[PDB]
Design a protein around this ligand. Structure first.
Ligand SMILES: Nc1ncnc2c1ncn2[C@@H]1O[C@H](COP(=O)(O)OP(=O)(O)OP(O)(O)=S)[C@@H](O)[C@H]1O
Ligand SMILES: Nc1ncnc2c1ncn2[C@@H]1O[C@H](COP(=O)(O)OP(=O)(O)OP(O)(O)=S)[C@@H](O)[C@H]1O
Ligand SMILES: Nc1nc2c(ncn2[C@@H]2O[C@H](COP(=O)(O)OP(=O)(O)O)[C@@H](O)[C@H]2O)c(=O)[nH]1
Ligand SMILES: [Mg+2]
Ligand SMILES: [Mg+2]
Lengths: 330, 332, 257, 352, 51, 258
DNA sequence: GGCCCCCCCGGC
DNA sequence: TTTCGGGGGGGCC
């Protein structure tokens, strides 16, 4: 790196260093801590969605086992490094079959993002894992479990990293606010958690952008409005008004309301579609075909939007689909 | 200069020349003083000023001289396979930042990191994108990444998670009129009232298209040699907009409902070269915003127009699609 | 400049780099007022290389403050190949440098070739793994060690070294057969350069990979003798002494099982 | 030399239809130093390439018409060798990357970038010896380019505009991606009217001294071409040759073989509706496709011939056009065209 | 800039009522021989050098 | 009616080999003065000029100037089968569809006579009117070959900065930069390797590494190469022949950052 | 020993 | 047949 840690992005500045700084995965953290505290470390696998703390957890565990010099006592490989059959057959085998250079102890191999590895390399890894288990332990990290071969999964003990809970996100936000000398409104925190979707990376990025947005962060307070302008996301009031107009007004009024709401702050149609879907999924529809039509048509519109197209036609299609689907309610 | 197209000649030189992207330009300017620029993912529709914004940020960060030693720009014209990602990008990100001069440190902020700009990142394969995940995080202290794309869905979820997202809003007559008026004034283009608003409405979020249309109108006016204000009729003609007479003829033929007459009229119409996208857009505008049709008719026509537009977006024959759409509307 | 170090003959540095370029990828130099000390670890984390070129090997060596330089041996070798084998070589660096300058000068003519190699942000420590008290320390001509390694590696991919009282045994057990070479200490006053010395504390028996020994033996072109120090629970040290510095290979033995 | 090529105009002043487009092109050529990238779209055979050449001749000198063909070599990642035939002039260059299919991308990354990133030696009309002008590159059949090939053009146009200017010609704009359409000045090229086609044919006949009983002949030939001037000229030449350079009131209109085959296929589909008929239709489709007849052309002509039948009702025509739209989309997204053509024919047989 | 091979290739494209295989076969042998002799007895231009 | 009896056919071999890569179809005008040729590269960015004077040939004569569009690859194929030290001659007739290359030797047995087909290439009135080039230098061919083969590894673009009493070479790439500064050099004991320079206004020109490599491929003709640099005109690299020279006008790489 | 080239699979 | 990427196995050197 260069200069102090204050030059780093918040996603990297607040990376957990120890195992007590990881939040939202209490069960997994406790289990791994107990395993490391008694020498009962098996071949580990961490399966989870993006931005949940798998890499942070494994690096913290390696630091706990070895110490500050963990980088000189582990073999860490990821998607940026070639991991072909030759690599598995030579480099990994040599690392697993040899003693530590610096200080005594067992050998740890961290194959981060192993789901990117080919089937041949994973197959070659089988006996490598099973033969040097006396002195070596393997850790695998994955987001998609369908890419891993059945045998490799069979040889590993699985741990699932759940989407981050609300309480853990609030505690981390409190720590970040205290360190950064920031003030966050309760509704601002609510909006941040809602838009995070269980990812701490999104929380930290949005909070950094909000801090940048404030003119005088020293005594200014971050409000839900700041989040909405920073992210460009529709306000809940805007979504509610659009849905109300679509559901109990004529086509002209609905079109005018949608256009005005979108042009007030330059909102995107995709965010509106997601918001309306979230609102409608809480509705109690009398008829199932209403929900079926809503889901099918909105999914089609979302797929069409994903490839460009005409924005006005797409908005009119959204309005018409909602109206037609709700006509079935009677 | 006088030998360059207006679109390139009025490319924002600094971050203060970006017209309607303040919600992100503000934080980008703040980074000039904070020196903690995060990984950025710019996404938005065409001609919203993403490449210009990143280039201006580089201008204001490093300066004219230190730029080339601190920027690595790769676009779709460059090979960006998994091997390239794992060798060239990794090597550049692993290097120490170039030494600034005394002048650079005296004048420009010179943050302590370099920048890699993967423009048009939506054209990169999934494996190549995955190869960047740990490169972005491991060397964040010496390198920062800017992924610029048009379709955010084409970026894999881990990369979007690692990057702070910036959406560029569409440019319309309410937020981009000032820049177009400034360009016209500098270029001394005499236009009637509402001509610039009409240009921006026709552009539909693309300021590059609006500038090109203004240049074409200016060239036409100069060649005419009449010293008369440019009118909206000429702007519409240069933009390929179908005249309202042809549109009312089309809707009347559709109202008639005869298949043979509609087919003959469409056959004659297709010989003029009108784009099907413009015809569909104008038909949508005419129908959805007309009080003479009931709710059910609009409900059906909206879906028909959406289907036709989606089919046309896949490079399909325009004649067949237009005929099918018109027949289906006539049978509504 | 901050650091200015002149090699009278570029062949010296080319040979020193040639001694360990086939076993490591990225090297880290750390220059001080007492010379240039460099470290390099291999991709498998099985072999470490430590070089300690002294100030007596340069025509003139000036270094104000300690300076770190992370480099890739491939690019360094590529550029060093550019320079001729009859020209003086100046290594030049500035305060917190972004590049290292290699200046080839031919006093015969007025031709000066300057090459700037961009540095890498390699942040690591040395840890000075030089375990105090080893179990056995032997010294013998590098030619004999190279011959033994080349002969035995052709039988098996693993070589076992046993140190017993006045006995050094190299054993290989492959598929076609096995091969054992036994050498005992001896001294020749007429030609001490060929003598073999052994100082023993406890018996030793350590296995090593043949590829790593084949890589290590390439340093015999720099020194006529090699010193091998072995100790259980510690990596094996293979030292080649130079005019003013030395080159050390620390090789981790294989797990016994 | 055929009459279609022997009387092609070579200057903007020689154009004889769509005078508004001619005036627009003259205005563009008045101050060509700031000319943006151009994209000419319109029906086939209207005269788009002729107008592009006339605009180039207006910008540069008459020397744009001294064309020479050369061969350029390319190497893929697999070492496979590829060859591209490039037409070049002292002032402009021409390329048809679609000729290499999915490999067209390489052109945009190797040939074009080579032209724009380096200056060119000009030892004529220059004193220093280096060209003081931008190079004009013409991409034909731009609508046939792959999406990645088009994406490779964006920064090339946006970075080296000071040295390279692109004039793309296409028949349809739907295949072109939005960024490329945004980066170009769009020029619509309407098809010539019947009166203009008749005037051109009359001039050709007078120059060639072809006896005509009445001028109405040239009218009918104009109507049979559906606005295609090239087809009109070639049809006039064919009829004149088949009637000993003398056209009478009873001279039939000659249609090409593939059109006759498609019409016979339509008649067979209408008459018989069964699986054996589908097998014979597959045979005919294979015969048509094996002789360089594009699948999209086959689909369009078959659909319109079916819709031009005086025995089907409105429901049948509606079903036919719907199936044609669906299977045209399928063809745009598929590789084996025979499958989609057979599916369309089967659906049409079922509906009838 | 057409050659005999190009002549045959062009003649081999037509389909339907315009198939020239039977007609070409029916052409007198002497006519084809004279055509070949005339073609090979002259110098012809080249559209592309080193194809 | 035309012959160009050579002192050594190896000279002609090297001459043809020096620009085979740059161009392949070049018009050769044979006059009583000698052989001339000027061919623009297919990319219109490089021009190959060649001329061999009557003096170089052992015995050259011609009754009527004749332009031959003979292929370079075919001539290379013809020569490569020839012996080392012979006296190639280029005889033909009034209406030559082919040119008979008489590979005659002092001995009556070591003969490699061949025939080379002629192509009808089109020639234009290329003008190479002299210009007041700001700078011009001459340096040994071996030094240029070494410098180019060295700097091509470190980059693809080579900048030739000719300032006051400086011949600076620059090559910047991803791994690093390479500069080999040369200065006016004279050796009384061996002046053949003396660097010559004459310089009026500073010249900055950056060229492609591939073009320079291809040009130096044909540098074996002369032990010295002369570089003529003009800011507003294409710089030219010249290799002297026995009685003429081989010049290459290589256009400069376009500067977009400026 | 190392490039360089050609051929062949790819789900579970 | 067939658009990358990875692996094997042979051929120059
Ligand atoms: N449980 C967590 N507690 C605190 N911070 C977290 C947590 N999870 C993620 N983060 C934050 O997000 C950043 C990235 O965390 P990561 O460990 O990279 O997540 P990840 O699951 O390994 O990412 P993937 O699956 O490879 S996309 C960290 O620097 C943390 O600042
Ligand atoms: N915010 C803006 N302010 C001023 N001019 C703009 C702006 N956005 C676009 N333009 C104009 O349109 C031209 C092109 O802008 P670009 O930066 O290339 O848009 P872009 O979004 O990066 O293009 P894409 O997404 O790759 S198609 C600029 O040179 C400007 O002249
Ligand atoms: N007399 C006359 N003939 C034209 C004109 N424009 C086009 N043509 C003729 O029409 C033929 C087809 O034109 P072309 O540009 O090749 O069609 P496109 O490329 O598909 O648009 C040409 O052979 C011309 O001879 C015109 O303006 N006047
Ligand atoms: Mg991770
Ligand atoms: Mg862009």
């Amino acid at each position: 790196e260069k200069r102090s840690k204050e030059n780093l992005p918040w996603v990297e500045k607040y990376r957990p260093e120890t195992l007590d700084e990881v939040y939202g995965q209490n069960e997994v953290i406790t289990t791994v801590r107990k395993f490391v505290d008694e020498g009962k470390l098996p071949h580990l696998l961490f399966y989870g969605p993006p931005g949940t703390g798998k890499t942070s957890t494994i690096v913290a565990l390696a630091r706990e086992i070895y110490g500050k010099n963990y980088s000189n006592m582990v073999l860490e490989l990821n998607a940026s490094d070639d991991r072909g059959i030759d690599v598995v057959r030579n480099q990994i085998k040599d690392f697993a079959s040899t003693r530590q250079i610096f200080s005594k102890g067992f050998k740890l191999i961290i194959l981060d993002e192993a789901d990117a590895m080919t089937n041949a390399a994973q197959n070659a890894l089988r006996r490598v894992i099973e033969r040097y288990t006396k002195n070596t332990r393997f850790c695998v990290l994955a987001n998609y479990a369908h890419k891993l071969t059945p045998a490799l999964l069979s040889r590993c003990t699985r741990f699932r990293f759940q989407p981050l809970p609300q309480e853990a996100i609030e505690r981390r936000i409190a720590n970040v606010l205290v360190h950064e000398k920031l003030k966050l409104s309760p509704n601002a925190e609510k909006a941040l958690i809602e838009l995070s979707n269980g990812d701490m990376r999104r929380v930290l990025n949005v909070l950094q952008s909000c801090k940048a947005t404030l003119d005088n962060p020293d005594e200014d307070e971050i409000s839900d409005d700041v989040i909405y302008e920073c992210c460009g996301a529709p306000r809940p009031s805007d979504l509610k008004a659009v849905l109300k107009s679509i559901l109990e007004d004529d086509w002209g009024t609905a079109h005018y309301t949608l256009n005005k709401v979108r042009s007030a702050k330059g909102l995107a149609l995709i965010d509106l579609i997601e918001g309306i879907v979230k609102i409608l999924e809480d509705y109690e529809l009398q008829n199932e075909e209403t929900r079926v039509h809503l889901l099918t048509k909105l999914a089609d519109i979302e797929y069409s939007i994903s490839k460009g197209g005409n924005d006005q036609i797409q908005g009119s299609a959204v309005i018409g689909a909602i109206k037609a689907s709700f006509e079935n309610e009677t | 200069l006088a030998q360059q197209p207006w679109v390139e000649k009025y490319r924002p030189k600094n971050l203060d020349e970006v017209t309607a992207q303040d919600h992100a330009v503000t934080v980008l300017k703040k980074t000039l003083k904070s020196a903690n620029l995060p990984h950025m993912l710019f996404y938005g529709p065409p001609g919203t000023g993403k490449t210009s914004t990143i280039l201006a940020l580089t201008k204001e960060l490093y300066g004219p001289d230190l730029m080339k030693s601190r920027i690595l720009e790769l676009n779709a014209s460059d090979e960006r396979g998994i091997s390239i990602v794992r060798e060239k990008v990794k090597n550049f990100a692993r290097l120490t930042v170039s030494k600034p001069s005394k002048h650079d440190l005296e004048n420009y902020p010179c943050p302590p990191y370099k920048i890699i700009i993967l423009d048009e990142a939506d054209s990169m394969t999934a494996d190549a994108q995955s190869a960047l995940r740990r490169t972005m995080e491991t060397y964040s202290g010496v390198t920062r990444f800017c992924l610029i794309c048009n379709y955010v869905t084409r970026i894999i979820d881990p990369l979007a998670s690692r990057c702070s997202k910036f959406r560029f809003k569409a440019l319309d007559a309410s937020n981009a009129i000032d820049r177009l008026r400034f360009i016209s004034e500098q270029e001394n283009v005499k236009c009637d009232d509402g001509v610039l608003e009409r240009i921006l409405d026709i552009s539909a979020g693309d300021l590059r298209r609006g500038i090109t249309l203004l240049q074409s109108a200016s060239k036409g006016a100069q060649y005419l040699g009449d010293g008369k204000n440019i009118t909206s009729t000429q702007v519409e003609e240069l933009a390929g907009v179908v005249p309202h007479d042809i549109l009312i003829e089309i809707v009347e033929k559709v109202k008639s409902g005869d298949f043979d007459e509609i087919k003959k009229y469409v056959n004659t119409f297709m010989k003029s070269g009108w784009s099907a996208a413009s015809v569909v857009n104008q038909l949508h505008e005419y129908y959805i915003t007309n009080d003479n049709f009931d709710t059910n008719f609009k409900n059906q026509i909206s879906w028909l127009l959406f289907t036709t537009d989606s089919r046309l977006n896949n490079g399909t024959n325009e004649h067949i699609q237009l005929l099918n759409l018109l027949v289906k509307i006539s049978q509504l | 400049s901050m650091l200015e170090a002149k090699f009278e003959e570029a062949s010296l540095f080319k040979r020193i780099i040639d001694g360990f370029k086939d076993c490591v990828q990225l090297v880290n130099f750390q220059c001080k007022e007492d010379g240039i000390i460099a470290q390099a670890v291999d991709d498998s984390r099985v072999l470490l290389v430590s070089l300690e070129i002294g100030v007596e090997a340069f025509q003139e060596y000036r270094c104000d403050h300690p300076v770190t330089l992370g480099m890739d041996l491939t690019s360094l070798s590529k550029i060093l190949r550019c320079g001729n084998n009859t020209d003086t070589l100046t290594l030049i660096a500035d305060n917190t440098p972004d590049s290292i300058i290699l200046l080839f000068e031919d006093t015969k003519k007025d031709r000066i070739a300057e090459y700037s190699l961009k540095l890498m942000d390699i942040d690591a420590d040395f840890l000075k793994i030089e375990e105090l008290q080893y179990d056995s320390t032997l010294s013998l001509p590098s030619s004999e060690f190279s011959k033994i390694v080349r002969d035995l590696s052709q039988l098996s991919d693993s070589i076992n070294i046993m140190i017993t009282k006045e006995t050094i045994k190299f054993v290989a057990d492959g598929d076609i057969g096995s091969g054992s070479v036994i050498i005992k200490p001896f001294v020749d006053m007429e030609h001490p350069e060929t003598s073999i010395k052994l100082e023993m504390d406890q018996p030793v028996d350590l296995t090593f990979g043949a590829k790593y020994l084949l890589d290590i033996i390439k340093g015999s072109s720099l020194s006529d003798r090699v010193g091998i120090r072995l100790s259980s629970e510690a990596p094996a040290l293979f030292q080649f002494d130079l005019k003013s510095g030395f080159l050390q290979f620390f090789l981790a033995p294989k797990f016994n099982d | 030399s055929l009459w279609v090529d022997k009387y092609r105009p070579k200057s903007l002043n020689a154009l004889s239809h769509n005078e508004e487009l001619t005036n627009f092109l003259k205005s563009l050529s008045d101050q060509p130093r700031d000319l943006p990238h151009l994209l000419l779209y319109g029906p086939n055979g209207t005269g788009k390439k002729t107008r592009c050449m006339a605009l180039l001749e207006s910008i540069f000198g008459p020397g744009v018409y001294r064309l020479k063909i050369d061969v350029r070599q390319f190497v893929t990642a697999s070492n496979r060798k590829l060859e591209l035939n490039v037409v070049s002039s002292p002032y402009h260059l021409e390329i048809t990357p679609s000729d290499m299919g999915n490999n067209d991308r390489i052109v945009i990354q190797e040939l074009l970038k080579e032209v724009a990133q380096m200056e060119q030696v000009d030892f004529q009309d220059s004193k220093d010896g280096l060209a003081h002008r931008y190079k004009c590159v013409i991409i034909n059949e731009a609508n046939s380019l792959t999406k990645d090939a088009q994406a490779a053009l964006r920064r090339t146009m946006e970075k080296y505009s000071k040295n390279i200017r692109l004039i793309m010609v296409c028949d349809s704009m739907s295949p072109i991606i939005a960024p490329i359409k945004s980066r170009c000045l769009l020029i619509r090229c309407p098809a010539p009217s019947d009166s203009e086609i008749s005037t051109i044919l009359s001039d050709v006949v007078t120059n060639e001294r072809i006896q005509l009983e009445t001028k109405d002949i040239l009218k009918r030939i104009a109507q049979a071409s559906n606005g295609n001037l090239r087809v009109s000229l070639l049809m006039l030449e064919s009829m004149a040759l088949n009637n000993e350079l003398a056209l009478k009131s009873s001279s039939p209109i000659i249609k090409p073989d593939w059109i006759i085959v498609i019409h016979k296929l339509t008649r067979k589909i209408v008459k018989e509706r069964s699986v054996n008929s589908l097998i014979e239709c597959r045979a005919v489709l294979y015969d048509l496709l094996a002789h360089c007849i594009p699948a999209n052309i086959i689909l369009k002509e078959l659909t319109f011939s079916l819709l031009d039948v005086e025995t089907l009702n409105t429901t049948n025509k509606s079903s036919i056009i719907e199936y044609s739209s669906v299977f045209d989309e399928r063809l745009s997204l598929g590789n084996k065209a025979i499958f989609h053509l057979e599916g369309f024919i089967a659906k049409v047989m079922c509906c009838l | 800039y057409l050659t005999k091979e190009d002549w045959d290739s062009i003649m081999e494209f037509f389909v339907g009522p315009d198939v020239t295989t039977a007609i070409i076969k029916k052409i007198p042998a002497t006519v084809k021989s004279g055509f070949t002799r005339k073609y090979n007895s002259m110098t012809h231009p080249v559209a592309i050098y080193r194809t």
